C-alpha cells in the first residue's frame, strides 16, 4: 500500500 503515491493507481491508501 502507498501513503502519498496512493493516488498513482495505488489504492486503497494506508
Swiss-Prot record:
Family label: Belongs to the conotoxin M superfamily.
Molecular function GO labels: toxin activity
Positions of disulphide bridges: 1-14, 2-10, 6-13
Statement: the UniProt record of this protein carries the keyword Secreted: yes
Keywords from the UniProt entry: Amidation, Disulfide bond, Hydroxylation, Secreted, Toxin
Domain notes from UniProt: The cysteine framework is III (CC-C-C-CC).
Higher taxonomy: Eukaryota, Metazoa, Spiralia, Lophotrochozoa, Mollusca
Localization: Secreted
Expressing tissues: Expressed by the venom duct.
Keyword Disulfide bond included in the entry's annotation: yes
Modified residues (Cysteine amide): 14
GO cellular component, one term: extracellular region
Residues where 4-hydroxyproline is found: 12
Protein name: Conotoxin Ar1446
Amino acid at each position: 500500500c502507498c501513503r502519498l503515491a496512493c493516488g498513482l493507481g495505488c489504492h486503497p491508501c494506508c
